[PDB]
Amino acid sequence: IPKAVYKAVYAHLYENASLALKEYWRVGNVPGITYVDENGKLCNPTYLHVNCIMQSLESRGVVKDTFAWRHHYYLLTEKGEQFIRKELDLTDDVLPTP
């Protein structure tokens, strides 16, 4: 599973402070998350890959999710906000956009 895919998930988390994921089979992979491959165009991380990273973050507690109507509803935790800042080389000056 590519490291750049992990980076985009953290990047989305600072950008939106949240993430919404659905099911195992890929419908346009995950629409709404985009990464650029070096020789590739804007590309979508696979639903399978995004699920693995966010679940790993959730056990440590980077995000907290509520499941309603077949959709995960992750919300960034304070511990997660600290983690995302280390991941994207950001600082205490930066706050999530919302």
């Binding site: 939106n16 402070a17 919404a20 709404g32 509520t66 499941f67 309603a68 509803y73 919302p98």
Partner: protein, 208 residues
């Protein structure tokens, strides 16, 4: 006279109705401490306004309103709408006791605090009666400290049971409180004849 039948506008209205119901469930799950009761969408030209009737606004707001901000972007992402364009406006609801949805939440917490079922139910009943409900009824059902299932119903005052007025004058809220032995489902029914908007059909006000 000639009209095409595509009428995609009817579909647009319906899709939002299903979206409102996906919001209701998601609000109830994450914001149980807040005391959230009901949700509606203004759905303005290009912008989404959600007005949530709720027992306490500040807990939903958050420090620097950060909690609300994350929720606005989570919903905007899920419903594929502009982030921040989505704005939720929390409204404190007065007469908390009358709002059945806040009262099942309070009873569910008391039952998880291990309050005795009679003690917890009576506490919910008095708060509704003080808020002016003519009748408050709480029913707790499941394996109450027994492997056999009972259904203890605690009720005070006058509560209507049938008719269209049940839709207008009766707030029926259902919870599924979870205990170690097994699910204990609680229903709180609160009846207010004076809800301002309408009068009881049977009651005749008469005159001097």
């Amino acid at each position: 006279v000639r009209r095409d039948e595509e009428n995609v506008y009817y579909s647009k209205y319906l899709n939002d109705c299903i979206m409102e119901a996906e919001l209701h469930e998601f609000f109830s799950r994450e914001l149980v401490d807040a005391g959230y009761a009901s949700c509606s969408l203004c759905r303005t030209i290009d912008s989404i306004c959600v007005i949530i009737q709720c027992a306490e606004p500040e807990v939903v707001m958050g420090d620097n309103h950060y909690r609300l901000h994350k929720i606005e972007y989570l919903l905007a992402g899920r419903f594929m709408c502009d982030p921040k364009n989505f704005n939720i406006w929390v409204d404190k609801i007065i007469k908390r006791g009358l709002s059945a949805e806040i009262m099942v939440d309070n009873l569910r917490a008391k039952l998880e605090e291990a309050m005795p079922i009679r003690r917890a139910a009576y506490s919910i009943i008095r708060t509704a009666m003080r808020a002016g409900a003519a009748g408050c009824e709480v029913i707790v059902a499941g394996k109450l400290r027994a492997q056999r299932a009972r259904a203890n119903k605690f009720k005070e005052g006058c509560l209507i049971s049938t008719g269209h007025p049940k839709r207008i004058f009766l707030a029926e809220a259902t919870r599924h409180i979870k205990m170690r032995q097994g699910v204990i489902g609680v229903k709180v029914r609160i009846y207010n004849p004076n809800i301002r908007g309408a009068v009881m059909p049977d009651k005749i006000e008469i005159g001097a």
